Amino acid sequence: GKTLCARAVANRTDATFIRVIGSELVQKYVGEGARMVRELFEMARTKKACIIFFDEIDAVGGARFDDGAGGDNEVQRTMLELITQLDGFDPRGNIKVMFATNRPNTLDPALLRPGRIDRKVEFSLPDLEGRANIFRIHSKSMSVERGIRWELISRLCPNSTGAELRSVCTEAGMFAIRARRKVATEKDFLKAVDKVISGYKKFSSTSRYMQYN
Amino acid sequence: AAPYAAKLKQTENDLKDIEARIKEKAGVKESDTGLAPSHLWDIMGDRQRLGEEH
Amino acid sequence: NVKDLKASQRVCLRSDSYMLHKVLENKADPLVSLMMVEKVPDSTYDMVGGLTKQIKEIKEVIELPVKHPELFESLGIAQPKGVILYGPPGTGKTLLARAVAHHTDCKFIRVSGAELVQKYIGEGSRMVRELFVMAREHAPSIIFMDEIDSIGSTRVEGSGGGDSEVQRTMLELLNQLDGFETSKNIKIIMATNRLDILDPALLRPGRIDRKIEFPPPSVAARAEILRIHSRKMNLTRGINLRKVAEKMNGCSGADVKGVCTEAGMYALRERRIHVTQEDFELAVGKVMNKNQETAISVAKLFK
Amino acid sequence: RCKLKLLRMERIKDHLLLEEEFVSNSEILKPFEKKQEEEKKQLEEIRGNPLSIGTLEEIIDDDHAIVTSPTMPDYYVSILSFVDKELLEPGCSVLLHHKTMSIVGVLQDDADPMVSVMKMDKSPTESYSDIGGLESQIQEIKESVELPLTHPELYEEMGIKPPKGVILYGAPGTGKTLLAKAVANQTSATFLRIVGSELIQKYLGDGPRLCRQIFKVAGENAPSIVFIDEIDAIGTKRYDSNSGGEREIQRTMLELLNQLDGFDDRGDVKVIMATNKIETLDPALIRPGRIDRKILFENPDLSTKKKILGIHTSKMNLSEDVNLETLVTTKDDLSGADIQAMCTEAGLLALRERRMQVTAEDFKQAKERVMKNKVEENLEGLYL
Amino acid sequence: MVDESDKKQQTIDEQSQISPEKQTPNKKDKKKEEEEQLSEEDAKLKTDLELLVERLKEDDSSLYEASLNALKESIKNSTSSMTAVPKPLKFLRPTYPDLCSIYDKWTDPNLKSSLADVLSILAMTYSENGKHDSLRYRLLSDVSDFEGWGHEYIRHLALEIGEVYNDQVEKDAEDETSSDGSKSDGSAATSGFEFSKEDTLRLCLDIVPYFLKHNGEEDAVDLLLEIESIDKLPQFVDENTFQRVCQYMVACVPLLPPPEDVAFLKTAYSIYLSQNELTDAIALAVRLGEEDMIRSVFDATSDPVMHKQLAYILAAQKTSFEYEGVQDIIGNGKLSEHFLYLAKELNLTGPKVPEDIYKSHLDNSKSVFSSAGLDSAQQNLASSFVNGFLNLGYCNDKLIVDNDNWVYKTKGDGMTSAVASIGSIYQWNLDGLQQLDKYLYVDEPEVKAGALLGIGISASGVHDGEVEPALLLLQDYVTNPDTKISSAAILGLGIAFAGSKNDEVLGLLLPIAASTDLPIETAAMASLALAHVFVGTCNGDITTSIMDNFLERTAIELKTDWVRFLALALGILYMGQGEQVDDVLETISAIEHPMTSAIEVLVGSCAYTGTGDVLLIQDLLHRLTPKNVKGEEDAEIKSEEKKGKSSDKDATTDGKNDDEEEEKEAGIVDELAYAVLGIALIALGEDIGKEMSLRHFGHLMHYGNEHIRRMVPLAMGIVSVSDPQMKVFDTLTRFSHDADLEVSMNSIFAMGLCGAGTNNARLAQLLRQLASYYSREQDALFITRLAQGLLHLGKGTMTMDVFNDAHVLNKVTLASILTTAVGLVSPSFMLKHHQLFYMLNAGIRPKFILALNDEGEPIKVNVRVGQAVETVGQAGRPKKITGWITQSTPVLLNHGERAELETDEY
Amino acid sequence: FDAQTGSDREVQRILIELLTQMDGFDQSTNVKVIMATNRADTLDPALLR
């Protein structure tokens, strides 16, 4: 829930949220997108108490390197246009800046210099306690027959996401309707833990991040 | 194919109504922007339309 | 009024307010724009003849559900989709698709990878549906998506054919086209140099159900192409064109049209009206010599 | 009598309906004569003629706006007379007054040749059980696609969020194509269908605008079911390499993650994806909760293929000669598109005869042609 | 094709393709010369037949045309068909196809016309022989395959169809017409038709409906009975035969306005009776609505078997299913006479066992409240009625009622309706009487009156077997002379017994409903109750009701409301009949006044039901006419005019509704629309008229049973927010209710927007609130349909109070009426001898595929769902039984019927 | 061609007129256009036909 706590924080702060998609920053002809970024930042300076949330800037934000015949250079113009605005020749006057990256595997080293992205927070996999917390937020929301263990379901699981725990409920809810139960019991929760895990292995849902830039 | 063939023609003849109905329904059709409170806005925005500032 | 007026019909305007005067005595049609700009005729089967077995195969599977889709309805058969014409170039693969279009009473829309035809969209990844929809308007039609399967040289490593990429888009549409305004009449006449270079997802079950191989010409068939060409020219009597077909061996239908042309350029030089039997000793020798000078190092028809 | 009964009621009712509306055209205008009749006069004079098309770039909240016309000149127009400012907001095409330009109303909107590929003109005439058999891996596509539209009640009892997404995967010809178009007939809500070969383009930047669009239209006209047919086609199809390539593939993928999901909070856009290259996708695509129940299909078993072959031979002429069960014997863990091609090829043998009958002989012959396809791009014979 | 002479037998066939030598020269010459040679022709007939058979395979027009060209001439030119009398007659077998080759294979317009007439004559003459039947047969079952016969055989069959149809249109009939030249009847073509029917029933389906209906007689249908009842099981299964039959009645159901329709459906009932399944018998007997047909099937199981067996249990179940209670009364007392067991049998027929099964479904459905918390003013009144509307059917909400606080805060007419709403909590239940009793013995008369209404509602589920009938309680109140008390009493009695016209119930209501001299507004209930009682069964068109209506018109015209209710009451009374209702239209019209004309247009709908297309057009000319006369001129009255206009609008909708149900289900999509243009229209026809057509639309949909329920109510609703009369919303919701929370997710939001948003009158607000709660029942408790459900062509009797109320501007007095809304559907459960309360499994199908029915017999693939689910409404209605794999056989076929499942486990 | 920008649709509109006037130009005693090109990879399929 990379983007889920930043929707939580968008509820709390009540500042402007201006969201960017990194694949939205690439246009047909080169230097068009140069226009876009520059302009967007200066509109946000005029704006008072605002937040720019950089989503999915894995393309457009990537590492700079030379190809000598590429078509990557044309994209790396806009990559540069992101640097030159953040330091500026003036500071950010109340612009709070988030960058959301799937990957630290490739990033710019001047979009990941430590003075303009300040403290940088690794978001982690839930613990054996942390899955129990998540799955209580999720089963308190569901009708279940009282006397259950939310601890049990976490153990059964390996080290895993809570996005699986949001789907342990909902697939258990489909095993709920097939039995023609208004309620959810232990028995259907077991079938569902088996269902998600078998699928994860079959593909390779975790410990994989793809791409190269 | 007698038993079926008769129905087949009668289906085509039927279709001819459906086209005709689209044209009669669309002959007397009206369209709006914003209805009842912007009837009021006509009183006002017609005095202001005579001037030049647009 | 608005019911005497319609889309893509030219009106006259009296311009001081643009107040509609008359309908104009013209109307534009967008499908002819494409068809002309490409430029292709139509034909009969007397301009293909000699691969008379081929005309039988294609008349069965294309012509007979146009004239009478009723027979197919009773049998209960989902009528042919993609029908592969393939073989050596110029063996009159293209002229068969033309010949069927006249007889079937279809618009012969030759597609050929061109975007010069267009100036209002300009790519074929946004003009698969619009192309199908013009052919629906001006129904029926024969959509000659000619995929050569060698265009580009990064596009053949890139997809096995960049033309087959667009072919795949069409063909999938095509699966539910059994009724939506009442079945097919927009045929997929596809063509290629072999099907070993076609993607194997274009030859998947039920997707391709008739496959038409076209050989190089027979010696009886090669004489029948020569005889058609002799009616434009003025010969001398006593020339057997069964003799000429045996001087030649050809390897395509391409070879004999350039034998006929060369004899009348040789008679042009001569400055006599008649075509003589000796011109055809030299002519047969000029094409057969040309055919070998692009294959000794695999040189193109260009620099 | 069984066709007729249907016809007799339904026709006579469409004939009456049509007639009704002719007498009725006049009758519309009769309950008013100054109560609305007068109102109409007032609006018109304001409007005059021509109403000049503009394009609205942005609004200002002081009753004005900046239009840029396609004829060149920008104008600082006023939003005055017969207009809500809630029906204004970027992207609108507006009616301007032919002396002083005031926005008298918004009526004009113009469809794209790309929303024309996306949007469908049909409702599928075929419905479910035209590839039927494997009809328990179909209640993973009707308890998560069909059913939360049909019943909110069931998922209200259990509470929480209701289902979201499916990825269909398996052998080719095992029904994937027809599955998607068979749930769209039953639900009857906006069925978008896009090919993945059109998501791959030979021009950059427009790639992402196309993929960003599909879900934006989708959420607007919600409920919607978006069939992405073939998302196996994103790594195997690619034109040139200098406006194609890695870069263009990576970007369209990135875009598609925001749409599904992402931060958008768009409309209902259940997703149906067909694939067989499921490992040429992201881990944030085959992520759970954008895939919920995922459906695996393998080749049918021997007794399943008997369900399949009796669907297909009902539409055909039959005899006592025909025997289904020995056709089943020959094929061994093959697709039901193989079985669908033998029946389609069997009438090709009828057509070839010009005999209206279909016999056991016609089904066995086309079985030999179907098995020729399989083992002759083979040339090993016996497994070397 | 080309001639290759007599070298082998194969090439003889090729020789005769161009020119026959054994059918043309030889034979022709032979016939035109010697008459010893008649003996040679006779032997050669067999040879000639064979040559036709071999060349049937050839399809080309040219090589049948020319080949048999001179034979076609020879009929009149040389042979003259009487040069050897018998011999040309029996040689007409090869020559008859020769004529058909110019009719059908070659099309020459002049000869195609002319030789149609010739073919008819020679068909008749050769069917004396019975060899014209055999001629048809070799092409019907075929011997060869060619395109040709597929167009040709029809022509032979069409000759018969032609003449028989023509005898109705043109009275002269027989061979006097030269359009066929063949006699209509007589023992020469009659025997031909019977034999033809046999062959065409086996292999085809085509000519069998044309023959019966073209004779126009039930006699034709009764001949059919004989042949089919042989076929019932050995030739093909029971099921195939049932599908074969029901349609004689259905294509030609809509297609029988009253005197024919009843006579045909009698025969179908009898076919079912003859066959194995009595289950098919009961469905058709209900349809007819005759008392006589119901009794015969019930008797057939009950009387012959001395032992209790399956037979007594089965009888009780079958009659139980109709919740009209018409079958219930009739079937009771036979059980008492036989006396195996009184206790089980009597209860099982009654709707008392239906109370118990509801508890099992309810055990699942639980309670979720959502009722308004508003108090004070008119908002108090709104909320208290709303509580009853959410707890319709058997529900337990005792404690809320027992809090008498909110109860006592109701005032005026509100008090009466408040007590009435309490009764709907215990609708279809024996217990609940206790709450009503408290109020009834204390305070002002207003609460006393409201108690009686509530007794009515509660008594719906218990009034048979002489177990607390509504009659017992309510008789005392009728005796009491106060008007409010008596009026309330007879309203509740009518509701509870519904279609039951028991002696005690009917005969109480028989001297009364005959005072209208005294001016009393609330004496609408006098006729209104009696009308409700009558529906569900054949009607006597009672002399009590007809008399009092006329008398009211004489006495008063001041109370406009009173006479408007009265007019509707007559039209609702006549429902359940149509044959007899043709007579009473004239009787009413005898006395003519413009006020009387208002009554006539209503009654026209019922008389003309089971066709309406002379009725439809009439109810549209009427709409035009007000405008037409003022319109015409340029190029006391108040009461009469208003009654006139309103009656017509109601009549138009009503006509349409009965019509759409009985007959083809496809046309339903359009029939709703006959109204959308009707509405746009009325909303268009007069300023005054717009008010009436809004309200009518909602009940149009509910009565008509529209397929589409998502788009049309919601879209119409938006326009009608602006428009006056919020009672429009109430009428929409009765349709929208459907299977709860499918349609109704959209409905609650849509209706809730206008209500919550706008407040500008608490009067307007009240109508909107009631409508919203009606639509939903918590956890899919029950559904409401106008239809019986047992038949989907059917129409209920309990839902007629709903249908009545939409003809008038909204009133506080009307609110008391609206509390009643009965019309329950039971959820099916597989029964045992110990009365098992669980279903095992069922298949549900949203859309029937079967184009071998309208109704669509539920297929056998389905989608499987669990135990103990409510019988789903639209988009779930075809229901097939899954139980066969677990060793269970249904005894009672269920197609999505109301009827509870019953299984015999093996 | 791109043909997604105003400037390409200018290039093209002239070429369509050449082709159209070249059809007009046939069966005349003129010599149909002499043209040269540096490379053979600027031809369109319709031009070369």
Place this chain on the structure above:
Amino acid sequence: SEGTSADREIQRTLMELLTQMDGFDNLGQTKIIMATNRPDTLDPALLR
């Protein structure tokens, strides 16, 4: 001109130079001195 539109802008302007340099337009007493910083960038029709 598998790239951007820029590259057919190059092409329009280049074709103009060739007709000048050698054509039925002839030069003259006009001279070209062409200064470049790397000559294997060029189109070989500008190496001519």
